[PDB]
Amino acid sequence: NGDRPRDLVFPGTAGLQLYQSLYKYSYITDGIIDAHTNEVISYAQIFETSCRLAVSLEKYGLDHNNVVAICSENNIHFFGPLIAALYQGIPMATSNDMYTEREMIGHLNISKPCLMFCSKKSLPFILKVQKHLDFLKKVIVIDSMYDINGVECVFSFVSRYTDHAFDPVKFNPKEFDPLERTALIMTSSGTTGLPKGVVISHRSITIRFVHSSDPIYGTRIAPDTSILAIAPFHHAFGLFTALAYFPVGLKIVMVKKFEGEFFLKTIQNYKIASIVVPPPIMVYLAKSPLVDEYNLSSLTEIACGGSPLGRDIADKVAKRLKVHGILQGYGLTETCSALILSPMPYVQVKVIDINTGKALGPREKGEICFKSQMLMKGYHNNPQATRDALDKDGWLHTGDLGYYDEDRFIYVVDRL
Amino acid sequence: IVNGDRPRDLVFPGTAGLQLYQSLYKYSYITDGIIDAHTNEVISYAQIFETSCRLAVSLEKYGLDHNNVVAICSENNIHFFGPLIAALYQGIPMATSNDMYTEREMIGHLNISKPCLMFCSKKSLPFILKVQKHLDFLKKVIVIDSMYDINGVECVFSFVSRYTDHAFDPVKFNPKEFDPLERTALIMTSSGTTGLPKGVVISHRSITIRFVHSSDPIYGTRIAPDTSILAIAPFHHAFGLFTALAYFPVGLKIVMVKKFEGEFFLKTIQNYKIASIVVPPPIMVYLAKSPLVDEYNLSSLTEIACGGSPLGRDIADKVAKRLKVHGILQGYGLTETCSALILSPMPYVQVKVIDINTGKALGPREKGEICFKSQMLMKGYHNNPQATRDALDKDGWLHTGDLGYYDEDRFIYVVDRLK
Amino acid sequence: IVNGDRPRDLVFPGTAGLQLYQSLYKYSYITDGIIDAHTNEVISYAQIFETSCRLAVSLEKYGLDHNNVVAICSENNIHFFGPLIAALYQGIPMATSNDMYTEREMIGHLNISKPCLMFCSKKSLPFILKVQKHLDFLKKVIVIDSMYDINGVECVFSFVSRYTDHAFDPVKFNPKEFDPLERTALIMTSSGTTGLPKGVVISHRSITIRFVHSSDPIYGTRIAPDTSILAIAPFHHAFGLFTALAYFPVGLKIVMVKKFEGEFFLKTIQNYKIASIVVPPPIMVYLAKSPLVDEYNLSSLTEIACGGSPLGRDIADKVAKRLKVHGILQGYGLTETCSALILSPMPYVQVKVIDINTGKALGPREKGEICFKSQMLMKGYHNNPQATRDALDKDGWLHTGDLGYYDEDRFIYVVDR
Amino acid sequence: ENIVNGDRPRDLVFPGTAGLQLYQSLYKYSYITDGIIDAHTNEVISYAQIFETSCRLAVSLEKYGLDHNNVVAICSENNIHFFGPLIAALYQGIPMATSNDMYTEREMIGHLNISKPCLMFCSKKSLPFILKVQKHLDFLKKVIVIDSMYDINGVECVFSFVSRYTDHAFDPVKFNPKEFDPLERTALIMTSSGTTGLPKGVVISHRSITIRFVHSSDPIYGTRIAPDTSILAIAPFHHAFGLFTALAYFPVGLKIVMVKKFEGEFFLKTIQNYKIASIVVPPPIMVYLAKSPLVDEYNLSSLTEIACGGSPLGRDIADKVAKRLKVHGILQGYGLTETCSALILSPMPYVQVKVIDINTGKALGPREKGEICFKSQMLMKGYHNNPQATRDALDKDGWLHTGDLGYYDEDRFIYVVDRLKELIKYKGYQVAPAELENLLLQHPNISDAGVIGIPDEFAGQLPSACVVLEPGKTMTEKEVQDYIAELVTTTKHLRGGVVFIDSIPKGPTGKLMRNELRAIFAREQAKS
C-alpha cells in the first residue's frame, strides 16, 4: 500500500490545477529567471500567455484528436504553450532539442503532431526536419515578439485569436476525465532498441503534484524563495520536477546545461534554497575541487531522481554542504520517476511469486512490481509494448525479487 | 448579481472535518501549534491531530451521531479544538456556549440545541454541573483541560483511553463522509435583531469556504506557514472560532491570549514575534490612540485585520501608520453568519440591490436594499422555522439592512449610500 | 549683457535626438527606467531605446518627415517617451496636447499645428476618436500603452512590427541629422499674454541646452546616475515635460505619479526611496504646512526644486528646515518657453535691463525693463508671426514685463526693483 | 573594404582639444575636495586646486613665450602635482615629454635629445639629477620644480613662476584654453624602446586622449564607478598606460588616491584604509593579487571593479583573482600597441581592425587566417623626428601591423580570436601553423609543446616536434607522426621525427625561444 497522501490529489484536469495555481500566485514577479541571459518572466505573465494561447490553439482548430509538440532547449517561455495544451487537453509531445535530423524524424513519427512550438535556436533545425513531414502543418516560435522570416511566433498567433480585453481570470480550462485524457507523449529510448513513445495521463501529473506538495518527501520550502532547475525540460524527470514547482509558487531560476562550474556561480548568486539534479551533478557536488570556493550556504534541500549510486556520494554531499540528510529515489521509472523512497502516496507495491503469480504477504520473496495511477497509461500507437510493460491488471513488472517488509515496517527491501 | 472575486483556491468539496484532518496530518511536524500566552502551556499540531482523532473514535463508540448534538463550554483554552474538530470528523453538530453566560441565560441557550453531551473547561465545570441539574437531556460532561477526572466528572483523557489503546494511529483513522452542505457543523447561538436566544445553523460547506478565503492571498492572511499569528477573539463566538480554526489548514504557529485587557497584548506581540493579528475594534482603538504602545517592539507585525464593528472614522488609518503595516484592510460588512464577506464581494459570495418597493434585481449604479447570497451563508435558525424564512428569503437571499447600488461591472465592489 | 554662468558641460552640438539616443544606448543597462507609481508597471531604458528606434524607422517608412507634425495626447504614462523621442530622432515636430482639454478646446489646439498622426493613451482614445471625427487632416491614431489593437485602432507595437522585423538592432540605427536650431522639436500650445490659442515653437537647441542645465552640478539635480527621482509634473506641459526628459541624459531611475493630489505623493516618496522631487508650488504648500506629513518617512530626500511662479516667502524655508535638505533653491524666473533661467542667470542665458523709455542698454544696479536672450528661447509662435515679433523684439531679446537691475559685475545675479 | 569596425561608442568623442575637455572637467568637478591623495605622505590636493594651478601655469607658460613649436618636458615620480604642468601644456597645445624618473644620465640624455624640450618641469627628488643632466644640454634653457613652495638654489618653482604672471585675483573660470585641431597637434611625446633597439619617441595626438576618455566613460568597458568615489592609481605616470589611465580619471571626477611604487603589501593597506572602489594595475600585482598569502588579512570589501592593462597573465591569474576578491569579473584587452594600450578587450570604440594576407595584403573575410592589423585615431601617430620608424610601424594608410595572425569570429559577431601570436614563427614550404593550430590541438598523453622548424631539406623547411612526457609513458617518434598524420593531412607531421626531451624552453611564463628547440633538436637527432 504505501504512505497515506497528506495533500489529497486534485480530482480535476491537471490543466485546471495549474491554471488555478498560476492565478493564485500571479503576484509572484520572479516566476522564472534565465540564469544565463537574465531574462525574467512573472507568474502573471505565464498565466496570461497560457490562457491566450489556449483560446488560440482552440480557435485555430485543435483538440484531443490532435497532438502538438515542442522542441526547445531549457528556456523561459517553454511553459506558456505546454500549460496551454494542458488546459485544452490536447496531448503534448516534447522533443529533445539536440536530436540529429535522423533521430528527430523517428521521434515525430511516433506521435505525429500537427503543430510545433520551438526555440529561436531550434527553429532552423525544425524547418529542416519539417520539410520531410507532410503532417507538420504549422511551426510557432515561443521566445520571440517578432516573426522569423514568415515563421509565426506565440505573440502574433495569440493576437490573431485574442484581443485587448482578454482576461485570463475569465478563461476556463476545458474539463475531462483526467485519467483517460493524455497530457504528454514523451518518447523514451530505454529498453530494447525501438524509440517507443510513452503516454502520460493527467492523473499522473496531479499525483506528481501531490508528491511535490508532501512535506516529508517533496521539497518543503517557502512559497517565495528561489529554487534551481537544471534538468532537461523535454525529458520526463526534468519536465515534471520543474512543472511541479508551480502548484506551490516558487521563484524558479534555471540553467540551460549541467556542464561545468557556473552551476556554482549560479547557485550562490541567487540564494538557491533547494536544487534537484541527476547524479553526475551529484559527483561534481561530492568529490569535485574548489566547490566550496563559492558560498553555497544557501542550500536547504537536495534531490536526486535518476540512477543514484551508493549512499556514500550521498553522504559526501550531505556532509559537504550541511544538509538534512539528502534522501531520494530507488526504482524510478520510464514514467513519472521516483516512487518508494526516503512506497509513496498513490503507489501500491506487491511481491507475488516467480512461479505462481499470486501475491504473497510479509517476509516472502518473489518478483516485486508496481501499481499506480501515476504509472504510464502504456505506450503510443504500439499495443505491443503496452501489454508488454504493465501486465494483466495494472502491475508493472520491475524485474527484481525481494519482500514485503511487514505491517509495522511497510517499506521496501529486495533480495535480488 | 455582483458575483465578487473568482476563487484562487478551489473550495475543498468534502467534509470540513476531512480538510481539517488532512491539514493537521500535513502540518504534524509543526511543534508550537498553540501556545497559552498565560500558562506557557503548549500543544503541537501532531498532538491535536492525535487527540482529535482519538476523541473522534471515542465519541463514535460511545454511541453518538448526526442525530445528537454535543456542546463545548470553555474560555479560550488550548484544548478547545480537541473535541470540536473531532465532532467535525464524525459530523456530529457542535453547539458552542459562551462561558460567561448567567445560569439564566445558559439554560435558555442549551434548550435551543438540547445537547446530550457537554465538554467544558475546568474553571467552567462548576457552573456546568450547577446548570445540568436543570436539564434532563444533558446526560454527560467531560473536562477538556485536565489529566485527572474531577470528582466523578470524566476528563477527555480518561474518556479516550476507554475506547482506544496505546497503539492507536491517527494516520489510519477516517473522518466520516457525508454531504458537506446538508450536515450541520455548528449551532452557534446569537440573540440579534429581536434579542431572543436564537441559534444559528452552519453547514460544513460554510467552513470549507471560509478556509478558501483564508488561503486566498489577496484577502485572507498571507504569511509563512510556521510563523506566529495571535488570535485572541473569543472562541465560542463565530469571529474568534472561524478566524482561529482557519489557521490550521495553512499551518501557523498560533499564540492565544485569554482576554483583551490593557497591555500584555503589547508585551506578547513583542515577546513572540507576532507576524499577524486579527482583533475586534476595541483593541483597534487601543492600538491607535493609546500611548507608549511604541514602548514595546511591535516591529514583527506584517498584517492586521479587523472583523466586527469596524470604526471607519479613520482609527484604522492611524494604526496603519503607527505600525508601518501594508495598510490594514478588513470589515466592509460581516454578519451573524460566518463573518467577513466583501472586503478590501468575496469568493463564493454574491450580493444584490433589487429595490425596497418591488424587489426586482437592480443593475449597475442603482440603489435599493443590499443583501447577500452564498453557500457560506447560514443555513438558518434551529428548531425555529419562523425567523429562518424571515432572515433568508424565498431563494437564498439574506436581507442585510442597507441600501447601496452595485458599483458597475467595471468596479465590481460595493459602495452603499445610507447605514 | 549679464551673460550668466559659464557652462560646466558644453552643450552637445548635434540634434537633441542624437543626444537622447546616445543616452538611451549608454544607460541601457538600467532596468528600472520608468515606474508607474500607481500600477507598478516598469519600463527599462533599453526597452525605450528599442521601442523608440523601431518607432522612428516606422514613422519614417510610413512616409513622414519634418514637413509633417505629429501629436501625442496622453496622461502621465510610462510609454509617453516612446514616440516622443522617436520624433526627435527623425526631426519631425511633436505637438503636445494636454490630456484634459475639452473637445471644444482640444480642437482649437489641434488646429494650430494641424498634425496628421496622433499617438494617444488607452484612456485618451475615446475622446480622441471623438475629436478626429471633426478633423480631415488627422489621418491616423496610434495607442501607446497597449500590446494589442483596440477596436480597429492600431497600437505602437503593431505599427512598429509593420516596418521593422525580428533582427532590428537599434545600436545600428542612426538618428536623422539636421541643424538643431532650425529644426523644430516641439510645438507646445500655451495660453499666455492673451486668452488666444497660440502655439510655441521649441528648437532642438533649446532641449540640448536644457540637458546642459540638468547635468550641471550646481544647478540641475546633482545625484548619482542610478538613484530614484520623482516626476509628477504634467508631461504634456513644458515644465513637466522637460524636467522629465532631461533625466535620461543623466540616467536616473524615474518614478512617476499621474496626479499630485493627496498623501499618495507622501506614500510614493517613501516607498520608492525618492532622492529628489521637483514640484510646482501647490504640493510645496502641502509640503511645508500640511499635517502628519512626517508620519511618513521622508528621510530619502537630497534635493528639492520648484518651477511654477516661485515666491512662497518663506514657505520654501519652512520645508528646507522641515525636511533636512541642503536648502531648497530654485525658480526665480520661469516662462512660456523652457521654464527656469536664472536660478539659485544660468548657462547660455543672458539677461539685460535697458530703459522703459529709450530701450538703450543700462550698466550695473540700474532700473528699466528686464528681458532675456538665449538659444533656449522660443523660436517664436507657430502660424502666428504677429505675436512672434511681439514676444521677442528686433534682435532676439524677449521682454518679460518686469523692471529691476544688475546686482553688479562683482555679483552678476538678479534682483529686480 | 572588409573591416571589423568595432563597438559603437556609448559616448561620442569630444570634438575639440584634449585640453578643453580636461578644463571643463576640472571646472565641473571643482567641488570634489579629495582630487589626488598621496597614499604615502597624506598630502592632498583638490580638483578646483588643480583647476587653478593648471590655468595659472597655462597663462604663465604663454606669457613666458611658449607655443606649439616648442616642447616642454617633465621628469617626476608619481606625485600629486604632476597634472598641473601636464594639463597646462594640454591647455596651451604645447607638446609634452614624459621622461622616466629613474633613467641614468646616459639614457636620459638620449631621451631628451629626441624632443629637445626647452622647459623642464621636475620634482624635488629629481632635481639634482636633472641639473647634472642639463649641464650637457644647451637646448634645455629653464628648469621648474613642481612640488615645492620655495625655489631651490635659484631653481624656480611652479609657484614663483606662476606668480610672476598671475596675481591674487586670477580666475580660472575666465581662462580659455587655446583652440586647434585635436588631431594634428601633438599632445605627448613619450619615448619607448625595446623594439629594434634604440631611443625612439612616440607621438600621441590630442584626439588619442579624447578617445581614451571616451573608453574610460564606457559603462561596459572603462571603469563605471560613481563620480566622487575613491580609485587607486599606482602605475608610473611617466609611461603611457599609467599616465592615461590616471589622466582619464578626471573626466569622470574621481577621488584618486595614488601610490608611488608597486612593491609589497603597502598596497593592501591603502586599498583598505581608503575604502578603494576600483583599481587598474599591471600583471605583477595581478599575480601577487591571486597567488600570495594573507592578502585576505586586510579587508578588501570595497572592491567593485578591477582592470588590467599590460602583458596579461591569461594563464589563470585573472580567474583566481576575480574569485578571491569577489569582483564583477576582471576582463581586459589585447593589442599592446605600445602607445595607448588596450584595443580589443573582454574591437573597442573608435578602433577598427582587419586581417590581411600573409602574401597579398587584401582584407580577408570571417574565419580567414592572416595578419591582424588595427587602425584607429587613438593609435600612436608616429615617432618624433624620425621618418624611418614611422613608415615602418604603420602602413600606407594608418593600419598598424601587429605581426600576429588570426581571424574575426563573425560579422554577426565581430570578435577577433587569433591563432598564432607571432608571424616570425611557424614557417614551412607553403606556410604552416605552429604553437596553436597543432601543439595545443593534440595531447594524448599530454606531451608539452614542440613546433620549431628544421632548415633541412634544402627542399623547404622541416617542421619537427620536441615532445616531453611526464608520468613515464612510452611514446615513439614514429608513433606520434601517425596520430597527427590524420589530424591535419596534407603533409605536416614532423618530417625529421618527434624528438623527446625534459621540459619545454625558457622565456618569461610561456614564451619559447624557438631557436632553442631547433638547436636542442640538433643534439637529440643522435642516440637510440
Author numbering:
A (entry chain D): 8 to 349, 363 to 436
B (entry chain A): 6 to 349, 363 to 437
C (entry chain C): 6 to 349, 363 to 435
D (entry chain B): 4 to 349, 363 to 544
Cite, word for word, the article reporting this structure.
The crystal structure of WT REPh was determined at low resolution by molecular replacement from two different crystal forms in the space groups P1 and P3121 at resolution of 3.05 Å and 3.60 Å, respectively. Unlike previously reported luciferases that are exclusively monomeric, in the P3121 crystal form, REPh exists as tetramer, although in the P1 crystal form it is an octamer in the asymmetric unit. The estimated molecular weight (MW) of the wild-type (WT) REPh from the SEC analysis was ≈ 240 kDa, which corresponds to the tetramer found in the P3121 crystal. Only one out of the four C-terminal domains was observed in the density maps of the P3121 crystal form and none of the eight C-terminal domains of the REPh octamer could be resolved in the P1 crystal form. Only molecule B of the P3121 crystal form has enough quality to trace the C-terminal domain that was not traceable in any of the molecules in the P1 crystal form. The C-terminal domain showed higher average B factors (69.4 Å2, with several regions with values above 100) relative to the N-terminal domain within the same crystal form (60.3 Å2). The aperture of the active site with an angle of ∼125° between axes crossing the center mass of each domain (P3121 crystal form) shows that REPh is the most open conformation among the known luciferase structures, which corresponds to the high mobility of its C-terminal domain. This feature indicates that the flexibility of the C-terminal domain may play a role in tuning the color of light emitted.
At the core of this natural phenomenon lies a fundamental process of energy transduction by luciferase enzymes that convert the chemical energy stored within the ground-state substrate (luciferin) to an excited, emissive state of the product (oxyluciferin) by a spin-forbidden process. Although beetle luciferase systems share identical substrates and chemical reaction sequence, they emit a range of different colors from yellow green (λmax ≈ 560 nm), which is typical for common firefly species, such as the North American firefly Photinus pyralis (GPp) and the Japanese firefly Luciola cruciata (GLc), to orange and even red (λmax = 590–623 nm) from certain click beetles and railroad worms. Here, we describe the first crystal structures of two rare WT luciferases from Brazilian beetles that emit light with exceptional colors; a luciferase from the head lanterns of the glow-worm P. hirtus (Coleoptera: Phengodidae), the only known luciferase that naturally emits red light (λmax = 623 nm; REPh), and a green-emitting luciferase from the firefly A. vivianii (Coleoptera: Lampyridae) that displays a blue-shifted emission relative to common firefly luciferases (λmax = 538 nm at pH 8; GBAv). Biochemical and structural analyses of the two luciferases, combined with computational modeling, provide the best insight yet into the relationship between the structure and color of light emitted by beetle luciferases.
